Design a protein around this nucleic acid. Structure first.
Ligand code: K
Ligand code: K
Ligand code: K
Ligand code: MG
Ligand code: MG
Length: 136
RNA sequence: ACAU
DNA sequence: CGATGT
């Protein structure tokens, strides 16, 4: 089982969990940063991981790219497969933004098609995903 | 347990 | 040490 180097890798970064959430996507081969989301003041690790995959899907579809996406998040991979982010985060005025983005990401999944393979990055075998923030 |  | 998730 080898790395598919012709791929996009995504990851969340946070200050606290729940806390400030951001995410980015990189070229797995080169590490070039292809997109970065502006920090969202409150969210969870898994909401951010989910938004990162969906953004990757949208980014690759817009560019007519058939590359797969790597994520290290078992949870977010399943949420994308299900088209449903089963987060426990309370809904209130401070979490409104992240929940709006998550709701809109689900809605995009429910209105668009893609063949993009969404693959588990095998951290145990390969080290940290190339999109990692270096904060652990 | 496993994945973050 | 705490948290988010299956
Ligand atoms: K990190
Ligand atoms: K990890
Ligand atoms: K746990
Ligand atoms: Mg991650
Ligand atoms: Mg990481």
């Amino acid at each position: 089982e080898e790395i598919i180097w012709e791929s996009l890798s995504v990851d969340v970064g946070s200050q606290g969990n729940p806390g400030i959430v951001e995410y980015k996507g990189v070229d797995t081969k080169t590490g070039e940063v292809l997109f970065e989301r502006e920090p969202i003041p409150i969210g969870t690790n898994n909401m951010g991981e989910f938004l990162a995959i969906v953004h990757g899907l949208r980014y690759l579809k817009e560019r007519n790219s058939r590359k797969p996406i790597y994520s290290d998040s078992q949870t977010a991979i399943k949420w994308v497969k299900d088209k449903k982010a089963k987060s426990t985060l309370v809904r209130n005025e401070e979490t409104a933004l992240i929940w709006k983005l998550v709701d809109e990401a689900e809605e995009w999944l429910n209105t668009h098609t893609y063949e993009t393979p969404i693959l588990k990055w095998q951290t145990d075998k390969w080290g940290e995903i190339k999109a990692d923030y270096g904060r652990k």
